[PDB]
Amino acid sequence: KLHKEPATLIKAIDGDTVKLMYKGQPMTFRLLLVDTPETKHPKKGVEKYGPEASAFTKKMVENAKKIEVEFDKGQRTDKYGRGLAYIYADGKMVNEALVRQGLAKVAYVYKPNNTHEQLLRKSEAQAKKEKLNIWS
């Protein structure tokens, strides 16, 4: 069973990355299973909808009363030392909110870190259908 754990917002970095205080230590978290347009793309810099996705995540985390992180079944940190997790702001999963709003696509999946894959694909299908942002 996956379980949620409290964290405290330090700073929103980009649409897909947020720095949190987890277990008393500052850490950078990469949102699992989603690829958002970035403002800090290593090769492109600011992408189309990058500023929008970035503001959406920032707003969501900054205005939350409670932030919780939920690790999946596999590796919990990537190659760059970023925690890999599903982030919740007042019970709402930020990863899903972005996809539902057409501000992110479901990323290439690496088992066993795919617990919420179907949920996200479902939201992405709806966003595509509604021709939202990325899909307009």
At residue 99, φ and ψ (nearest 5 deg) are -65, -45
Is residue 6 reached through a cis peptide bond, with omega within 30 degrees of 0 on the bond before it?
Answer: no
Q: Are 89 and 67 in contact (CB under 8 A)?
A: yes
Q: Are 22 and 5 in contact (CB under 8 A)?
A: yes
Report whether 77 belongs to an annotated binding site. no
Classify residue 1 by its DSSP letter.
Answer: -
The three-state secondary structure class of 120 is helix
Q: What amino acid positions are annotated as catalytic residues? A: 30, 38, 82
Report whether 36 belongs to an annotated binding site. yes
Can you list the domains of the chain with their CATH numbers? 1-136 (2.40.50.90)
| Resolution of the PDB structure in angstroms | 1.7
Residue type, 122: K
